[PDB]
Structure formats: structure tokens, C-alpha cells
Amino acid sequence: SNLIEVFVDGQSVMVEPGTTVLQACEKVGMQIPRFCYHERLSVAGNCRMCLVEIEKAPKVVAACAMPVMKGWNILTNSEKTKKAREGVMEFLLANHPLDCPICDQGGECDLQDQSMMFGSDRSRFLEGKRAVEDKNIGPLVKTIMTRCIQCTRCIRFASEIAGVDDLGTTGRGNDMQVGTYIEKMFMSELSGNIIDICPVGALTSKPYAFTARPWETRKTESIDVMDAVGSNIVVSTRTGEVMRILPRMHEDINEEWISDKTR
Amino acid sequence: EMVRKCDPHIGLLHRGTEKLIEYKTYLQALPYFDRLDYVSMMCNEQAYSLAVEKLLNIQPPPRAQWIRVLFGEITRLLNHIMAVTTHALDIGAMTPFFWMFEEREKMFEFYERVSGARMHAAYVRPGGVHQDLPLGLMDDIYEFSKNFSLRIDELEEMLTNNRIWRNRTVDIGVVTAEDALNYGFSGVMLRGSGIQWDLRKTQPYDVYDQVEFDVPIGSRGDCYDRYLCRVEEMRQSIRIISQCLNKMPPGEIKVDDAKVSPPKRAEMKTSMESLIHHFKLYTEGYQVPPGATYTAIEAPKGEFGVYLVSDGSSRPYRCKIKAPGFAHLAGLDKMSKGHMLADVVAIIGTQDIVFGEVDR
Amino acid sequence: TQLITVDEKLDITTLTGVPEEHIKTRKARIFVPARNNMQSGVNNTKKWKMEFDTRERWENPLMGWASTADPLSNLVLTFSTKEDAIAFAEKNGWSYDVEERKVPKPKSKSYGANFSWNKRTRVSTK
Amino acid sequence: TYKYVNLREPSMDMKSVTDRAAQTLLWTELIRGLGMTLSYLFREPATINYPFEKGPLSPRFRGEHALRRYPSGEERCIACKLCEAVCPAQAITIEAEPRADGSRRTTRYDIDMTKCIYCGFCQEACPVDAIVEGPNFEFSTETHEELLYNKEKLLNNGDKWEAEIAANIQADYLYR
Amino acid sequence: TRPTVRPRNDVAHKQLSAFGEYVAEILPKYVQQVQVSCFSELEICIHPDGVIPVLTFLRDHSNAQFKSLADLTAVDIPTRQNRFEIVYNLLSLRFNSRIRVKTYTDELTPVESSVSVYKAANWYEREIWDMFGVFFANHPDLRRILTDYGFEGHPFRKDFPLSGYVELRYDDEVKRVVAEPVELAQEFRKFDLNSPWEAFPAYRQPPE
Amino acid sequence: ASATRLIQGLRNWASGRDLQAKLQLRYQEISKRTQPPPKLPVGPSHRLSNNYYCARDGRREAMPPSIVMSSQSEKKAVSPAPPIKRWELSQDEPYL
Amino acid sequence: EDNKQFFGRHRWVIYTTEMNGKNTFWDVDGSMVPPEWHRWLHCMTDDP
Amino acid sequence: LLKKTTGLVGLAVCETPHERLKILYTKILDVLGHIPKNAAYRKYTEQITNEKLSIVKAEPDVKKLEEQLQGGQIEEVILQAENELSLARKMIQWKPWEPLVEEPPASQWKWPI
Amino acid sequence: GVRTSPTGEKVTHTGQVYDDEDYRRVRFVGRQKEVNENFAIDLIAEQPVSQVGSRVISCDGGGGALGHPRVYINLDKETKTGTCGYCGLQFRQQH
Amino acid sequence: TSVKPIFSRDMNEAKRRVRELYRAWYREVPNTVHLFQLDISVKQGRDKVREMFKKNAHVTDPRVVDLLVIKGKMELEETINVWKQRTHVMRFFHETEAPRPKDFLSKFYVGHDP
Ligand code: SF4
Ligand code: SF4
Ligand code: SF4
Ligand code: SF4
Ligand code: FES
Ligand SMILES: [K+]
Ligand SMILES: [Zn+2]
């Protein structure tokens, strides 16, 4: 075979050429923190959360984008990997709004959870945060853009899976806004799935909005009947009442998406 | 008149506490410990807190440790007032009950000033204590301690040299040292037998290696030397309270790890990291690294221990609670042989038995 | 000798104290739980779980609370492998069904594929 | 570092033996105990005149629950369900929806006061000081379901006790 | 790592490691594992045929003298075929030390009672009968200690539900407290709290 | 405190103690019920520099237990610790 | 007030004989105290 | 000097502690000679028992013998000698120097699961 | 801002009122249905819109640490005010 | 498949122990009816004993029936020594419990349970 040997924390693993650092760490059972990487979207590399130390190399690499070279020792838990994660989590939480009680992502937030797991416990940002104009992209997806961390899973999903090309980033620098630039209504057949992949509560479900909260929901694994695809879903209920419908991953059917009628 | 066999049937207050701990988080399971030895609330809080802090590999700040030792000895005064005065009340001496429950009312006022509840404070937490001392509390603890020795002296006037009290205690419930060690006795039940053992001295916790006190040791293994050991432990608790009021350090009262102890409400409303940590510590809770500890304190009834098993989640996988009264009431059958029926209530009094911790 | 040979199927259903209604009319589901698609973390997809079929929840006439009569409605069990869950359900007389573990298949990722000379996989923006 | 309670040998000279015999025959310690009981007879008792005199409480006191408001009449509760997540006895039942002005508000805020352990984890989990555990402890009922508070009862407890609750929070918020 | 981190006790770790080697080589017939935790607690994981010989050793040997039985504990772990983990916490007052002796059983294999070694165990393993269903051979009076008298089921087993299967009420027809199947007016609300992110990389298990 | 000196003298004679020096009822010696507002200090981790969480992470320094022995010469017999030092009798009040 | 009385006797209320339509001449009640006097009477503050 | 009490309830004072300890230590060694030589219990118990017996034979005093045997009172040193004797008599019957009777199952001591 | 159903029952600020044929009105027979007559939706509408001269405003609810967490509201829309998600106060850029 | 026994090496010793436990319960039923002053007959109590013994009559494992005999001896000791009250004896007679629907059609009429 053409498998190259790399090392994750000293453990040998045989990987295909072209495999990234993140996938090599996944093959030894370690999940690198990420915000913009998504395994069904194109590699962006613009949140810098996956920065990891390769040893004998004085610069961290973006594990979601960097291919492994033969003989690398990926240090997923070293001192400068943790310092990189804390610095990037500090910059993500600098201008992020204190909305966790009134945000629907609370409890099932990637930003909350891997701030608890990989960032620090306190703030140094002594300034005033930014605030972003909200957008009206339709009756399904509520949009609160102050919570946006600009990971561009919006744009990659709408471009590559939904095939729409109507989301994007306007502006430049810290005023860079994810949006449509116009009053445009993002109504695709797969338009609600951006609620899934948005790691923050910038894009939430407008019908699910404010009604429940993820830890109190019971997760019943079930099947879509809205068409003959047979999409695997999670009906999340709460005290004998159906709260919402999430997808299940099935690699051969619905990869991890569902349609808007299903959702 | 003699007692041949004593079979204590228990479980009348079995509540399934430590199964209810398995479906709750660590902060959520803390107020079950107020309700086990329900005269020794903050001590059981301390034993659970030390167990969780040992499994979390963190330590409380020094002022939190001095507050825990101060309120542990206030709590020890509470429990030995309860012990001695109900042990005298069941025998017939009903008057120092009322004389000492006013002092016990004032120590419940201390609990309520520091936490908001008179008994179940939920005040000693994993990471420190919940809230700092309000201003003027240490002055009133000093005003209590300055007068409490006279209360012990008039209790000891009413009971110690009383020949009716000595007839009901001196040759009653004699426990040898080897049988006390084999029956799992702890605390005063060992110390009346002459065993020199005290977990505040031998296996010390928060700042008990920095306070100076004495351990009262019995000679005859009976109800009367255990009475004298509890009276002298009230004396030494007053001594430790004086040393805690003089050596109270400045500083913070929670550990300054905001992934374990919740942040301040002023910075929860200002900082993003603090709001996230407040959110996750009050909804999920902190994850405890996997492992099993047996953390024991010298509670006022004896060795109070928690065998806490964590699986890496925010909820205890297992929390076994060792109470002193469980092994004490198991040894009741040996301690009551060769005695009378009216001696059985005195032996149930000299074993300080609260059935909340006995039954869980 | 001090060891006996019991060639029978392991069955503890007479010893568990579970009433018959909650042994023979229950369907245990043995499954690895799906990843919550609100999140990219996978640490909840590492163990096998056993749950039961959800029974009736109705409205409390006084408060509108969720009244139940199912004792097993919260019983979720954790198992290291699939065979431990199967053996625990067979030992307890529970009729079970097993869903196999769905792993994500290994994707082919390339950052340079975002900028191909002649393939459709160019990103229109980045 | 230890001391011996009760390891005294009594003196066997005729003076001490006659002292112990005068104690045995003349009941000297029994008169000592009667003297101490007589000494409390002439003390002022510690008895307060309830209900006209009240036990001293602190501003931290954890009594009856109340949902609070802002100084505009808007209720502080923004339906985040942190109080029912932290609630050790699961006494808090919350249902929410966006109301007519789109605000995140509850449609159900129930507290079973007979499950409640009065530990105040809800008022310290609350990010906006909405639920508090106020100063009322005299709210005994004649019926069990009178201790099953809904959102209307809790908002009325807030409107009832707010003048006192705000001052207690004003006293204790710098310790929190 | 000074103020907020627990100080590590290396001396006790080395001493308990030396004594764990000591016990493992004096008793190789029953000792399966020996481990010392990071907070310096020694665990001797033994075979269940050596409950009496190991506990008699630690109680009576002149280098051990673990004269006190602090606590006796079972743990239900249903993923193991020997699901019950019997835990003996022991205290040596002479050497001021604590040891943990751990063994295992399933629902049907009896564990030998340790009342001949420690009389303190007389109620503890009795409770392990009541709460877990572990039978203890040659116990003097083995019966239930905490549950109600007609109680079916061993409650601290993890397949036992939180509320039970029955609930009591007074019935005025029969003039008697009766037991009925449990119906909750409010169901216990199960919270799925566990984060999907790895918290402790030092405890990462090797994947399949 | 309002007892007449005749009753106060009878009371001190009957108890045998000067009871007025140590009264069990509280008077103006106690703290005010209204206190000035505190300014509580912050802990050691309230710093703007050299305050990385990885350098003070207590939960992530906990390790799995070191397996000393597993079943997969003239060395000294050891004990779990040194023998306990004999306790010393109190210089304060030994009752001896 | 009477600050010569001991702590607990030093503040008290003489209840009204009629509150909210109910005769309270004999039926006095601890919950009759309004909240602004409930801090003072329960000694949560020095200030009426 | 004839110590009046041991301080422990039910542990009676020994009139001749040196001779009782010599009898108990030689009896422990006589019982311990019936254990195989490679057994670690025999090697370790012979080592500590010969150390204690040489300390007893080297010191005529009772107080100094207590402070250098370092096991508390001399009567509980006698009690520990009786406990070691009873233990070694049981260790002959148990034969715990044998190999391990049974390996555990493969994930029996794996925590967490 | 309480109204009344044709059954004579006060509609709560949620909007809850029992139907006429609902038996659960019998719990209020001889007793009362406790409603709160200070509707927060009617009281937050009574507040004046704060005219500020900035583009991003911060709200904490007033009182400093006695309010809600401090959020930042953008005021770029001149069509609509910027409402605080916690306290419901609303803000308008004065230009 | 070599397991450690509890009391019985095989099923015949186990049936001996089941039989002696049934003899002890059969002797105990009139005393239990008398001193707990029950409202049942001695024949009805012996019917309940026979019903509870026949409930477990399908077990083929010696260790499981050893634990069943042990638990029956424990219940018998709780009955002879008067540790149970009247209520614990009468819990075998599910009297205040209404009879459940048994066929398909009445279970269809009342709800959703199979
Ligand atoms: S997106 Fe996440 S971190 Fe941001 S406010 Fe919502 S829950 Fe909090
Ligand atoms: S709205 Fe969400 S998915 Fe879109 S770029 Fe922002 S953070 Fe990413
Ligand atoms: S005080 Fe405690 S038990 Fe009561 S509602 Fe609040 S969190 Fe729940
Ligand atoms: S009372 Fe507070 S914690 Fe509870 S849901 Fe409302 S805002 Fe959240
Ligand atoms: S995940 Fe690699 S940079 Fe965003
Ligand atoms: K989202
Ligand atoms: Zn606001």
C-alpha cells in the first residue's frame, strides 16, 4: 500500500496520502477542536481553532487544512497547542454577545462547550463589543448576526450542497458581515440545514425559537415519512410533546441533512 | 430486667439518597449531605466537598479553608449540644436541653447570616464556600464564644458530679478498645476506650494542622467517659473557634478556577467567558475526572466518609456514604448485653445516632 | 470440586423484582446514540446505550405536568460494547433490537481542491 | 496534644474521705444542681413574644419564591431554564414561547413548593435576578395544592414583596 | 500551578506503591491488580476467592495492621459480566494509612462474608444484600436492612428505576396502607447533560 | 441586664458564678443589622498577563492511576507509611 | 423599639384591630406585617 | 516500674513483657519455618520478627523497648505478636504463595467503562 | 391589561382561559383564579424609546450588576428600533 | 460454565430446599391468618403460597432457585417474627388494584399498552 506513517502524540498511525492532520488525529480517537471545518463542506481554514503543534516545527499548522507529511509527530495536547486554542477562543469570545440565556444554542453550543474545554475561564477584553444588524433571510431561519463568528459554513453550504450562491461576506476586517447584502429570502429546499451547521446561535430555527432547551429534550431516533428518501431523524420531545426534528447521520441516505418539510 | 438480645430494625428513614445522587450533578447532590447527619450539616458538606476537590485535583483558597474549619467547629458545638442534651433528656435530665438550645439557636443564626438557611446551608461547596462572610459576623461569633464556656460549665454543673447521672452512665456500655476497632467504631466511641485517634490530628484536612487543640481520651470505655469526651470536645471546639477568628486570612472564598467554581455575578454580567462558565456550571456542571475516592473527615459523630466514584461526566456514578452511626448501631447489640432495658436508652444516647445518616 | 456445571441459559428475571408487565411487554433498544447535529463533538457517540419504548405521558389535570405510569421511562443504561448490552438484555428477559454503529466514512479532503484549474469543485468565494 | 478525661485517683487521707462522705450523706452536689436550677429561675427568659416579636433574620434568608421585574414593569425572566436545570429537587417547571412582541418569555413557570428544598440554587443560577427566594416564611396553607405555585402566583409574590426583596438584594449583591 | 491546583504528595505515592508491591508479592494467589491513584490511594484488586485471606492478612500482619473497616461498598457496573464490584475501605491506625480492597461478583456467585475478619461488616454486606442482591455466604443473620418488608427488587442496581415499581397509599375501604403500581403526577425529567467534547485527554481510551 | 442587684446577687450566689460578666441574652454589644457595603477581593487568577489556563489547569493534571502490579533478593519489608508517632500529653490541661 | 430589652424583644408590632376588612382585634397574624416593615421587624436592617 | 494501666480498655498490663515477647517471637518463627522458603510472607515475616526479637533481646528496659519497637504500648506489641502468630498459622492452611487462581475478565478493572 | 372571557373568567397574560365546557373551572367555584394584572407586555410598551447619538448602544437593564448581562445593540436600521433581548427597552439612533 | 454453587450442587438438592420451604410456609399460613387477624381464609392463604411457588416453577438454574429459597426463607422469617405488619402480608393479595384488561380488545379500549 501507499500508506504513510505519522504520529499523533507519539502513537503511530498509517494514513493515506492527502489525509489531513485532523483526520490523522481522528484515526487515533482524538477530536481536534474546530469551528469552520466541516467534513461535508470544503476546507476553509479561517477560524484557526484547530491549530496544533507539529514537533520540531516552530509554527502551529491548521489541522483541518494541512496534509500530514511522513514522520510528523502531531502534539494534540502540548503547551503551545493549548496556548493557540486559548488565544483563538479569546478572540472568538471578545466580540461575542453575552446572550447565552436568551440564545437558543445554549447547552448545545459548540462555542460554549469548547470554550469550557479548550479556552480559558475568564476575560481580558476591556472594550466595547461590536453589534451587527440582523438579517431577514426568511421565515424558517431566525438570524441574529451579532452571535456570528464568521466561520463561513453558511456560504459553503449554500454554495456547495444547497447550490444557491446567495450567501456571502460583505465588508472587510472586523466589519465583515455574513449575509445576502440585500433583502433576500433564502428559501431553498435544504435551507434549514444551516441551522444545524452554524456552530453558534447566529442562525436558529424560527419555529423552534425560545420554546425548549437541549438538555431537557428526549431524543427518539426515527424516520422521515415526508417523501420516499427515508431520512433518519431525531424527534426531540419534551414532557410528552414533540419539540423539533433534527437529522441523524446515515451515510447512504441523507448524509447528515434533511429537507425543510422534514424539519 | 436484663437484656439478652437487641435487634435494631432500621430503614424507617431510608430515603434512597445515594441513588438520587446518581441522577443529579455534583452541585445538585451537595444538599443531600445536609440531610444525612441533620445536626452536623456543614461538616457533611465539607466531607463531600473534600471528596470532589480531591477528584478534581484542585484546592480551596486559604480563607475558604479557615471558614470551613470555623463553621466545622460551630457545627461540632451544635452536634454535641444535641448529643449531650438529648442523651440527658431521654434519661430524665430535661432542663439543660432548654438551657443549651438557646445557644444552639444562636449558632443557627450564625448559619442563617452566612447562608440564608438555619440548618441546611449548602454553604461549603467543592471549590471553597459559596459566599463570603457578611460584615460583623466574626464579632458576633466572638461574642458567642466568649460566653459559651459558662454554658458548658453550668451543663457540667448539672450533670458531671451528679450521682444520679453517674449511676446511669458509669458502668453502662463498656467497650473494649479491640472490639471498638473491630466493630468499625469511630470518634468518641473509640476515644472513650482510650484509643488515641482523631482524624483532625492524624489525617488532617483543611487547616487543622494549623490550629492547636487537645483530644479528650477516656479510660473506662463507658457512657460516662464518652459524655466527658463530648463536653471536652465542646471546650476544644471553643478553643479552635478562637484560633480561627484570630487567624482568618484575607482573600477569596471560591477557588479562582471558573471552570469549577462559578464566577461572580458582576463579571457573569460583563464577561463572555464568565457567562459561558456560569451557564455551563449551573446547567451541566463541571466534569470530574474519572476515579474513586474515599474521603473521610472527623465529623462530630466520628469518621464520616464518602466513597465517590466518577466516570468522567458531570454527575456522580456512585456515592457511598459511610456514617459513624451505622457501625455504632450495629455494635449496639454487643454494648447492651448484661444491661437493663433502661440502660438501652442510655446506650442509644451515648452512641450519637442520627438515623438520617444511618439509613441514608 | 467446589464448582458446579450449569449448562442453562442465564436468566435472573425471577430475582430482579421487576413485574411481569415490564419484562415481557417491553422492547429494549440497543444503540449508539446519534451525534447531535447542532454540534460537531463526538464524545456522546462512544458508548452503547440501552433504552426502552416510550409509553404514555399525559397531562396532569391540576398543573399540566407530564404524568407518567412507566417506571422504565428514564432507564438509560451504558455499555462498553454491543455484546455486553445484548448479554444484559438477555439475562433480564428483555426483548431487544440492536441498531449497528454508524461511523462517518472517511472523507477525502484537500484545501487545494478549492482552486482547481478545470473541476467544478472551485469555490466561488472563500 | 491529647488529655485524659477521668483519670483522677481520689485522695485517701481522712480529710478527703470525710469530704466524699459528707457529699454522700449530705447531698452536696444535689444542692449544687438545685442551686443552678434556682439560678436560672431568677433570670429573664429568652422567650420572644411571637407573633408580635419576631426572630432575627439576615438579608440572605431563603423563604418564599418570587419572580421579579425590572424598574419598568417588564418581568426579568427571559425563559432560559437555568433555574430548573440546577434545581436539585426538580421543583421548577418552565415552558416558553415568543410572545406577541417577539420577546423570549415563559408561558409556564411552576414551582412545587413541596418539592422545593429552599436552597436557593435557582436564584444564584438566575442570570438576570428574576427568580429570588424572598423573605416570607409565614405562608403555611391548609391544602396541598395551595403550595403548587404557578407563574401568576410567583409574579404576584414579586409584586407583593418587591419593596423588601430589592432592599435585601441591595444589601447582599456585593457578596454574590 | 501553586494556588488553585491541589499539591501532589509524592512521598505517600512512593510509600503506597512500595506497600502495594509488598502485598502483591506476599499474596500472588489472589492479587490481580495493584494501583495507586494520583491523589495517593492504594487499591488492591483481588480475586473473590481471597476475600478472607487478604483481609485477614491486612488486619493481622505486623507491617499492615489494618484494624479498622472504614466502609464496605458495592458498585453496580452493568457492562461487566461480573457487574458488582465489592469495595473494602480499610484503616491502619498504627501506620496511619488507608487501603482499598476490591473484588467482583455477578448476581449468582456468592461472596464469602468477612464477619470473621471484621464484625463491622455484619451490617454493611447485609446492606449489600438489600441494595444489590449480592449474597454473602456464611453470614450470621443475612436479611434486608433498609427496604420495606415486602420489597421486591434490589434498588441500587442500575437497572432499577428511580421511583420504584410500587407506591403506597392509605386505602379506607380495606382500612389499610396498600401498594399499587407507581404513577407519577409529574414524571422525573431526565436531563441529557453530557458534553459532546472530550474533557480529559489523559483518560482517553484507545478506539476500536 | 435589667435585674435588680438583690435578684442579681441571689442569682450569682445560687449559680456560684459571676453571671453578669457573661450573659446569655444579647444586648448592644452585637453587630449592627445594617452594615457598610463590602469590597471583596479577587483571587490570584485575576491577572491580565501570564495567566494562561493551561498553566493552572487542575482538572487536566489528574492522571489515571499508576498500575503498580497487574496480572496482564533481600529487599526490605515495607509498611504503608512510617509508624505513627506517639501523641504527647497536653501541657495545657492534661487532667494530671 | 426598646433597645434596653434584649435582642429579639427590642422591636415589636402591636397589630391593628382591623385589616383588609377582617376583624383582627383577637385574630392577629404574623403575615399582617407589610413588606416595608418586615425588614425592620425581623431585623434585616437597622432602619425603619 | 509496674505500669498501672495501659490506657486501652480491656488490654491488661503484662507483668513480664520481655519473656512473653521472646516466647511469641520464637513461636512465630517456629510456625513460620513450616512455610516454603521462597514465599514472600516467610521472608518478610522472618525479617521483621528477627528485627523485633533482636530489639527485645538488646533492651532490658520496658519504656525504651516501647519507644524503639515503635508499636505503642508493650501490651499491644504482645497483641500484635499474637495476631501475627494466628495469621501465620492461617497462612499455612491458605497457601497464598501459590500462583494466581484465575485471571479476571478482560475489562474487569477498566475504569471508566 | 386583563380582559375577560364570556364565561366570566380573566384571561392571563399568557392567554390562558378555560373553555366553557371545560370541567376544570370547578376548581375556582367558591374560590378565585389568581391572575396578575400588571402585564409586562403592556408595561414595556409604555416606555419611551431612548434617542441616542451612537451607532451601537449598550444595555445592562440599569443598576449595573443588578440588571441583566450587558449586551450591545446595533442601530443601523432606521426603519425599526433596536430592542434589548433581555429587558425589552428599545433604542433609536437620533440621526 | 463451571460456576460456584450457593447451596445446591444440582437441581435435586434445589428441589429438596424448595420443598422444605413450601412445607414451612404451608405450616405457617394458619398462624399468619390468626395473629395478623386477616380477613382471608387459611385455604386462600395457602392458595396464595401455591401461586407464588408456581410463579417461579420454570427455573432450571440451581443458583437461581437457591436464591429464591433464600428470599422465601427471608420472607418467612419476616412473617414468623412479627416484623411485617398486616399490610405487608396483604400485599400478596392485590385487592385495591383494579383488574387489568387481559384480552386485546379491552386493552385497545383503555389505551396504548400492548
Ligand atoms: S452562540 Fe453560544 S456562546 Fe454565543 S450566546 Fe449563544 S449559547 Fe452563548
Ligand atoms: S452565521 Fe453561523 S455558519 Fe454562518 S458564518 Fe456565522 S457562525 Fe458560521
Ligand atoms: S430553592 Fe432550590 S429546590 Fe427550591 S426551586 Fe430553587 S433550586 Fe429548586
Ligand atoms: S427565572 Fe432566571 S434562571 Fe429561571 S428561566 Fe427565568 S431567567 Fe432563566
Ligand atoms: S477548523 Fe481548521 S481553521 Fe477553522
Ligand atoms: K445554530
Ligand atoms: Zn436591557
Side-chain angles (χ1 to χ4, degrees), chain A residues 18 23 31 39-44 108-110 113 160 165 195-196 218 221 246-247 249-251 256, chain C residues 29 33-42 57 66 73-74 102-105 107 109 111 114 123-124:
Chain A
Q23 290 171 349
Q31 193 183 10
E39 64 182 359
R40 302 184 193 276
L41 300 176
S42 67
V43 178
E108 58 185 1
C109 186
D110 275 329
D113 289 341
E160 298 168 356
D165 286 327
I195 301 162
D196 281 331
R218 298 176 183 270
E221 300 184 355
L246 294 169
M249 181 187 73
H250 194 282
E251 290 291 329
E256 67 185 10
Chain C
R29 181 170 182 263
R35 181 184 59 81
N36 191 1
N37 279 316
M38 290 283 112
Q39 273 168 331
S40 291
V42 300
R57 295 178 178 90
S73 66
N74 297 318
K102 297 186 188 298
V103 296
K105 68 181 181 180
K107 306 295 186 293
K109 292 296 184 181
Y111 182 75
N114 297 328
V123 293
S124 65

Side-chain angles (χ1 to χ4, degrees), chain D residues 22-43:
Chain D
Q23 184 180 3
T24 302
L25 291 175
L26 297 173
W27 303 348
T28 297
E29 84 279 19
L30 302 177
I31 307 301
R32 292 282 294 273
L34 287 178
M36 191 64 72
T37 305
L38 185 67
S39 74
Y40 282 47
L41 175 64
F42 291 99
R43 302 186 195 185

Side-chain angles (χ1 to χ4, degrees), chain D residues 65 83 86-89 91-92 111 115-122 133:
Chain D
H65 293 278
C83 57
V86 80
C87 182
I92 302 165
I111 294 171
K115 293 184 188 179
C116 178
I117 75 170
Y118 297 90
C119 73
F121 290 182
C122 51
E133 193 169 1

